[PDB]
Amino acid sequence: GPSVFLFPPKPKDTLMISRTPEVTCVVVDVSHEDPEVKFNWYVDGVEVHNAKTKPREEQYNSTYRVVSVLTVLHQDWLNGKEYKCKVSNKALPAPIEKTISKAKGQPREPQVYTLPPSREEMTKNQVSLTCLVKGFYPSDIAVEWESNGQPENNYKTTPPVLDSDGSFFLYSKLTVDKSRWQQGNVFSCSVMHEALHNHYTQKSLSL
Amino acid sequence: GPSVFLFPPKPKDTLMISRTPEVTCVVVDVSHEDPEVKFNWYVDGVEVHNAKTKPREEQYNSTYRVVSVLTVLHQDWLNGKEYKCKVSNKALPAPIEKTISKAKGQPREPQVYTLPPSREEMTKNQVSLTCLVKGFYPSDIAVEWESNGQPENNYKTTPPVLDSDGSFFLYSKLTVDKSRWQQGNVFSCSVMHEALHNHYTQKSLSL
Amino acid sequence: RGVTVRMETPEAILFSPGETFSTNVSIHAIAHDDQTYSMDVVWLRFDVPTSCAEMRIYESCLYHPQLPECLSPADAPCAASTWTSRLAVRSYAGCSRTNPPPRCSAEAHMEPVPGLAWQAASVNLEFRDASPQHSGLYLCVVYVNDHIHAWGHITISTAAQYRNAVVEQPL
Amino acid sequence: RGVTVRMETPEAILFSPGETFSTNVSIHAIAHDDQTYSMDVVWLRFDVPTSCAEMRIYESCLYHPQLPECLSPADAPCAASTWTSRLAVRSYAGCSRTNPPPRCSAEAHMEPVPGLAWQAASVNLEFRDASPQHSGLYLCVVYVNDHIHAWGHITISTAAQYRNAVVEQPL
Ligand SMILES: *[C@@H]1O[C@H](CO[C@H]2O[C@@H](C)[C@@H](O)[C@@H](O)[C@@H]2O)[C@@H](O[C@@H]2O[C@H](CO)[C@@H](O[C@@H]3O[C@H](CO[C@H]4O[C@H](CO)[C@@H](O)[C@H](O)[C@@H]4O[C@@H]4O[C@H](CO)[C@@H](O[C@@H]5O[C@H](CO)[C@H](O)[C@H](O)[C@H]5O)[C@H](O)[C@H]4NC(C)=O)[C@@H](O)[C@H](O[C@H]4O[C@H](CO)[C@@H](O)[C@H](O)[C@@H]4O)[C@@H]3O)[C@H](O)[C@H]2NC(C)=O)[C@H](O)[C@H]1NC(C)=O
Ligand SMILES: *[C@@H]1O[C@H](CO[C@H]2O[C@@H](C)[C@@H](O)[C@@H](O)[C@@H]2O)[C@@H](O[C@@H]2O[C@H](CO)[C@@H](O[C@@H]3O[C@H](CO[C@H]4O[C@H](CO)[C@@H](O)[C@H](O)[C@@H]4O[C@@H]4O[C@H](CO)[C@@H](O[C@@H]5O[C@H](CO)[C@H](O)[C@H](O)[C@H]5O)[C@H](O)[C@H]4NC(C)=O)[C@@H](O)[C@H](O[C@H]4O[C@H](CO)[C@@H](O)[C@H](O)[C@@H]4O)[C@@H]3O)[C@H](O)[C@H]2NC(C)=O)[C@H](O)[C@H]1NC(C)=O
């Protein structure tokens, strides 16, 4: 029988007004004998009709993958509305329903602190710039780095870790050529979260 | 039919000579009608006989859980020896074999850097003490905190994140009262890893 | 005080007929106070004649497209300095620091253009089975309380139709 | 230079007959140079007579258990100052900063004692179905190149047999 997986929109798509967030209802293990799948979408119980079906895709393991995409409103998602996807197919005894929405709990603003590289690390060829983002809720977030308005791609960010106060925290590490650091270059840690003013905040770091 | 899961020893048990590391072969979904399970252990192909069977445990979901424990030598594990557990039972058409050993790859010494709280944090109730452990391989590690020889339990450590150079890094955050930090108190980050001299190193943090 | 808008996007997208693609504009808005504001993300499209060596964007004119020199641009056929029809507009109302841009979405309009569409809950434009008819100079302008707070241009076209766009600015 | 050994463990373990438990000694070794060394983790057991008010450990004697005053302790029946049989010994050879303690494990010996055993690849002692016969004063001594680098004591016994152990030390 087919299986269903309901995915939430990307954090950046929900936090930026210049983007379009969407919920994705993926149906796997669709058979060749019965590939026709019906979708019924609901938002807080109220059925909606603006969803679109992505083009069918052959998986080569004897099944198809049928997907439905529903566009959501930034404020609807952020306000904790529930999205339900009902999937019906002749090889399914009864319709399958999955529900997903934002994590419930009072949103808390993340505290962002930039931390310079340890003096002990200067003996190495490249150094580590840290950015501590803590006290945030929910875990949906986006953290990036930049310098002179240009994006710095040489970083790794830990997954959110649940703190002892019910909030989340994480650490992001940008690695730069020691020369760049010692020269006074200014680097910034950009964080996007719903509880921040205008969903954004930027914290700089330099020698 | 029964299922098998083979677990490696704890990092601290392999790194401390004062402890005894062991591999655990867990067999779940053992049936009430045929709970007799035979174990055959091998170390690099050579069959060994010093394993012990843990007392049988009723799961209350119609099945038993049968477990076998094999004690290993610190050096044998650290040297990348392979441990295979073969599980035979009447309900099993053919014996099941699982193999586990240390992660293969040249071990690399972790660089440990302690990072003090941000100036911006000096106005909150509690401050954050950071410890950056990077450049290590394999990911098997143990990180703890202490002050005046006494263990500090108020910390959270991110899981190891794979860096762009094939090594791992992580961050540990200890949260303390601004008073303590202000007073000049000495806090430390204890790290245990096979690649460290004596599998140990401490990094102090204060003013 | 007020609102700050910053836009980021490549200046050109070269496409071959039949391809499907979308713009990749990035827009961030920061409300410095708790005042309520309205926002409009507007897309303008300009014809790029074959005989034009390059297109000229009269920057100062974007702020007052009704001035004589802007309504009748000197570089006439090759100038982006005023407009009538708006290709597309996504409007926001009742926006604030606490009810930020995505949440304050209100209306959306788009001219009927074969193969053109909004990529759902996004300010980017999507082109399906792109054809030469889609080539031209596109401008994305962001208004806050009916005043431009940010703008950018993208020349979207096939290689043969492409003409460099130049921003004519004050000293 | 040399090696530093630090030991940590509670000073007492009270048990009731029939219980199974183990010691919880922690030992860390730090090699400050690349010199090769040998190590021996030795467990000593001392009888604690019922008539003793307390046991006295002659610390200085641990380093020279063959001196007259150590072989014939003044507090005679209630003194831990010398030994003959060693309850258990885990030996290490060819150890170094690069071939650290666990990896340099070589031999292990333990006296035949009902219910006593090594908890596999560990320096701790395990007591199964503990009985009054197991009560006594235990010392864990760590040697590096045949010289004591660390030591600790644990009074392991039932409540009725327990006697406080006191370390007699120099000024
Ligand atoms: C036949 O083949 C099928 C296709 O598989 C192909 O790949 C390999 C498997 C090959 O071996 C070969 O077979 C095929 O070429 C195969 O389907 C798979 O079936 C799995 C089990 O049935 C199923 O597992 C679940 O996976 C969930 C996670 O899925 C995501 O992550 C995986 C891996 O990273 C990825 O492959 C999926 O595509 C999913 O990826 C996410 O997709 C969403 C939706 O598009 C993205 O979100 C949107 O992104 C857009 C982008 O523009 C927008 O941003 C929009 O706003 C977003 O909404 C999202 O970004 C993307 N994430 C990632 C990381 O890529 C698990 O959640 C799930 O586990 C949960 O549930 C189970 C059961 O309840 C529990 O056990 C778990 O504990 C957990 O609770 C589960 O693991 C695979 O996902 C599925 N693969 C695909 C590609 O669909 C089929 O089984 C085969 N059948 C046979 C008989 O062989
Ligand atoms: C009948 O009931 C059984 C029991 O159910 C009840 O227990 C709960 C846990 C729930 O299961 C709940 O429903 C019930 O109340 C049930 O058994 C379960 O069956 C699962 C599927 O068959 C099986 O899943 C696998 O789990 C692996 C991880 O297991 C560990 O972690 C979980 C929690 O994170 C824990 O519950 C387990 O006990 C395991 O814990 C580890 O245990 C080892 C050995 O004791 C520890 O290592 C030793 O520790 C000692 C000290 O104790 C020494 O230090 C020694 O040196 C060490 O070696 C270890 O510390 C400990 N770790 C943790 C974190 O606790 C997954 O790895 C595994 O995933 C793989 O395979 C799946 C496919 O199966 C893939 O999808 C994955 O991608 C991956 O490849 C898998 O998920 C459960 O483990 C099992 N639970 C138990 C307790 O046995 C049974 O299925 C039920 N059957 C029916 C028909 O209903």
PDB file of C-alpha atoms and ligand atoms in Angstrom, chain A residues 3 5 7-10 13 22-24 26 28-29 54 59 61 63 65, ligand 1:
ATOM      1  CA  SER A   3       2.664   5.637   2.228  1.00  0.00           C
ATOM      2  CA  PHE A   5       4.741  11.977   4.323  1.00  0.00           C
ATOM      3  CA  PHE A   7       6.486  18.216   5.180  1.00  0.00           C
ATOM      4  CA  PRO A   8       6.482  21.768   6.669  1.00  0.00           C
ATOM      5  CA  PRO A   9       7.710  24.799   4.730  1.00  0.00           C
ATOM      6  CA  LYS A  10      11.345  25.980   4.918  1.00  0.00           C
ATOM      7  CA  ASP A  13      10.270  30.882   3.347  1.00  0.00           C
ATOM      8  CA  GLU A  22       4.439  25.735   1.043  1.00  0.00           C
ATOM      9  CA  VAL A  23       3.397  22.450   2.651  1.00  0.00           C
ATOM     10  CA  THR A  24       4.276  19.303   0.665  1.00  0.00           C
ATOM     11  CA  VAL A  26       4.396  13.267  -0.661  1.00  0.00           C
ATOM     12  CA  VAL A  28       5.299   7.001  -2.081  1.00  0.00           C
ATOM     13  CA  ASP A  29       4.900   3.391  -3.169  1.00  0.00           C
ATOM     14  CA  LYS A  54       3.575  18.105  -9.113  1.00  0.00           C
ATOM     15  CA  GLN A  59      11.037   5.719  -9.132  1.00  0.00           C
ATOM     16  CA  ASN A  61      11.727   0.350  -8.040  1.00  0.00           C
ATOM     17  CA  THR A  63       6.446   2.433  -7.865  1.00  0.00           C
ATOM     18  CA  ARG A  65       5.893   9.083  -6.307  1.00  0.00           C
TER      19      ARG A  65
HETATM   20  C1  LIG E   1      10.825   2.977  -3.943  1.00  0.00           C
HETATM   21  O1  LIG E   1      11.653   4.128  -4.112  1.00  0.00           O
HETATM   22  C2  LIG E   1      11.168   5.277  -3.391  1.00  0.00           C
HETATM   23  C3  LIG E   1      12.059   6.448  -3.764  1.00  0.00           C
HETATM   24  O2  LIG E   1      13.371   6.269  -3.190  1.00  0.00           O
HETATM   25  C4  LIG E   1      14.416   6.657  -4.046  1.00  0.00           C
HETATM   26  O3  LIG E   1      15.624   6.933  -3.338  1.00  0.00           O
HETATM   27  C5  LIG E   1      16.231   5.796  -2.675  1.00  0.00           C
HETATM   28  C6  LIG E   1      15.346   5.388  -1.507  1.00  0.00           C
HETATM   29  C7  LIG E   1      16.533   4.661  -3.671  1.00  0.00           C
HETATM   30  O4  LIG E   1      16.861   3.490  -2.933  1.00  0.00           O
HETATM   31  C8  LIG E   1      15.360   4.341  -4.616  1.00  0.00           C
HETATM   32  O5  LIG E   1      14.440   3.463  -3.970  1.00  0.00           O
HETATM   33  C9  LIG E   1      14.650   5.603  -5.145  1.00  0.00           C
HETATM   34  O6  LIG E   1      15.421   6.173  -6.197  1.00  0.00           O
HETATM   35  C10 LIG E   1      11.134   4.976  -1.890  1.00  0.00           C
HETATM   36  O7  LIG E   1      10.665   6.140  -1.176  1.00  0.00           O
HETATM   37  C11 LIG E   1      11.204   6.392   0.080  1.00  0.00           C
HETATM   38  O8  LIG E   1      10.428   5.674   1.040  1.00  0.00           O
HETATM   39  C12 LIG E   1      10.923   5.854   2.379  1.00  0.00           C
HETATM   40  C13 LIG E   1      10.203   4.855   3.254  1.00  0.00           C
HETATM   41  O9  LIG E   1       8.898   4.595   2.759  1.00  0.00           O
HETATM   42  C14 LIG E   1      10.759   7.319   2.795  1.00  0.00           C
HETATM   43  O10 LIG E   1      11.269   7.498   4.136  1.00  0.00           O
HETATM   44  C15 LIG E   1      10.763   8.521   4.929  1.00  0.00           C
HETATM   45  O11 LIG E   1      11.609   9.644   4.752  1.00  0.00           O
HETATM   46  C16 LIG E   1      11.142  10.794   5.472  1.00  0.00           C
HETATM   47  C17 LIG E   1      12.076  11.931   5.104  1.00  0.00           C
HETATM   48  O12 LIG E   1      11.919  12.248   3.705  1.00  0.00           O
HETATM   49  C18 LIG E   1      12.715  13.330   3.304  1.00  0.00           C
HETATM   50  O13 LIG E   1      14.103  13.020   3.368  1.00  0.00           O
HETATM   51  C19 LIG E   1      14.528  12.002   2.435  1.00  0.00           C
HETATM   52  C20 LIG E   1      16.005  11.740   2.691  1.00  0.00           C
HETATM   53  O14 LIG E   1      16.706  12.949   2.944  1.00  0.00           O
HETATM   54  C21 LIG E   1      14.227  12.454   1.000  1.00  0.00           C
HETATM   55  O15 LIG E   1      14.628  11.450   0.077  1.00  0.00           O
HETATM   56  C22 LIG E   1      12.731  12.732   0.857  1.00  0.00           C
HETATM   57  O16 LIG E   1      12.453  13.212  -0.449  1.00  0.00           O
HETATM   58  C23 LIG E   1      12.317  13.778   1.885  1.00  0.00           C
HETATM   59  O17 LIG E   1      12.954  15.036   1.570  1.00  0.00           O
HETATM   60  C24 LIG E   1      12.261  16.183   1.916  1.00  0.00           C
HETATM   61  O18 LIG E   1      11.227  16.389   0.962  1.00  0.00           O
HETATM   62  C25 LIG E   1      10.387  17.498   1.319  1.00  0.00           C
HETATM   63  C26 LIG E   1       9.176  17.475   0.388  1.00  0.00           C
HETATM   64  O19 LIG E   1       9.526  17.709  -0.973  1.00  0.00           O
HETATM   65  C27 LIG E   1      11.202  18.792   1.310  1.00  0.00           C
HETATM   66  O20 LIG E   1      10.375  19.885   1.776  1.00  0.00           O
HETATM   67  C28 LIG E   1       9.900  20.793   0.830  1.00  0.00           C
HETATM   68  O21 LIG E   1      11.025  21.210   0.044  1.00  0.00           O
HETATM   69  C29 LIG E   1      10.692  22.182  -0.968  1.00  0.00           C
HETATM   70  C30 LIG E   1      11.963  22.382  -1.805  1.00  0.00           C
HETATM   71  O22 LIG E   1      11.841  23.457  -2.731  1.00  0.00           O
HETATM   72  C31 LIG E   1      10.154  23.471  -0.304  1.00  0.00           C
HETATM   73  O23 LIG E   1      11.175  24.089   0.473  1.00  0.00           O
HETATM   74  C32 LIG E   1       8.942  23.167   0.590  1.00  0.00           C
HETATM   75  O24 LIG E   1       8.594  24.328   1.348  1.00  0.00           O
HETATM   76  C33 LIG E   1       9.235  21.998   1.548  1.00  0.00           C
HETATM   77  O25 LIG E   1       8.009  21.581   2.148  1.00  0.00           O
HETATM   78  C34 LIG E   1      12.413  18.642   2.241  1.00  0.00           C
HETATM   79  O26 LIG E   1      13.264  19.768   2.114  1.00  0.00           O
HETATM   80  C35 LIG E   1      13.203  17.372   1.946  1.00  0.00           C
HETATM   81  N1  LIG E   1      14.160  17.145   3.012  1.00  0.00           N
HETATM   82  C36 LIG E   1      15.315  16.537   2.761  1.00  0.00           C
HETATM   83  C37 LIG E   1      16.236  16.308   3.948  1.00  0.00           C
HETATM   84  O27 LIG E   1      15.681  16.238   1.625  1.00  0.00           O
HETATM   85  C38 LIG E   1      11.096  10.511   6.983  1.00  0.00           C
HETATM   86  O28 LIG E   1      10.454  11.591   7.647  1.00  0.00           O
HETATM   87  C39 LIG E   1      10.338   9.225   7.310  1.00  0.00           C
HETATM   88  O29 LIG E   1      10.563   8.877   8.704  1.00  0.00           O
HETATM   89  C40 LIG E   1       9.561   9.195   9.643  1.00  0.00           C
HETATM   90  O30 LIG E   1       8.444   8.329   9.532  1.00  0.00           O
HETATM   91  C41 LIG E   1       8.762   6.926   9.657  1.00  0.00           C
HETATM   92  C42 LIG E   1       7.429   6.189   9.568  1.00  0.00           C
HETATM   93  O31 LIG E   1       6.391   6.908  10.237  1.00  0.00           O
HETATM   94  C43 LIG E   1       9.526   6.643  10.979  1.00  0.00           C
HETATM   95  O32 LIG E   1      10.094   5.338  10.929  1.00  0.00           O
HETATM   96  C44 LIG E   1      10.647   7.661  11.249  1.00  0.00           C
HETATM   97  O33 LIG E   1      11.117   7.512  12.581  1.00  0.00           O
HETATM   98  C45 LIG E   1      10.132   9.077  11.056  1.00  0.00           C
HETATM   99  O34 LIG E   1       9.114   9.351  12.021  1.00  0.00           O
HETATM  100  C46 LIG E   1      10.814   8.088   6.397  1.00  0.00           C
HETATM  101  O35 LIG E   1      12.147   7.723   6.730  1.00  0.00           O
HETATM  102  C47 LIG E   1      11.550   8.193   1.813  1.00  0.00           C
HETATM  103  O36 LIG E   1      11.325   9.564   2.095  1.00  0.00           O
HETATM  104  C48 LIG E   1      11.141   7.890   0.367  1.00  0.00           C
HETATM  105  N2  LIG E   1      12.040   8.574  -0.543  1.00  0.00           N
HETATM  106  C49 LIG E   1      11.568   9.463  -1.410  1.00  0.00           C
HETATM  107  C50 LIG E   1      12.575  10.123  -2.332  1.00  0.00           C
HETATM  108  O37 LIG E   1      10.377   9.774  -1.475  1.00  0.00           O
HETATM  109  C51 LIG E   1      10.198   3.792  -1.655  1.00  0.00           C
HETATM  110  O38 LIG E   1      10.171   3.444  -0.281  1.00  0.00           O
HETATM  111  C52 LIG E   1      10.705   2.608  -2.463  1.00  0.00           C
HETATM  112  N3  LIG E   1       9.813   1.477  -2.283  1.00  0.00           N
HETATM  113  C53 LIG E   1      10.249   0.230  -2.445  1.00  0.00           C
HETATM  114  C54 LIG E   1       9.241  -0.885  -2.233  1.00  0.00           C
HETATM  115  O39 LIG E   1      11.416  -0.047  -2.744  1.00  0.00           O
END
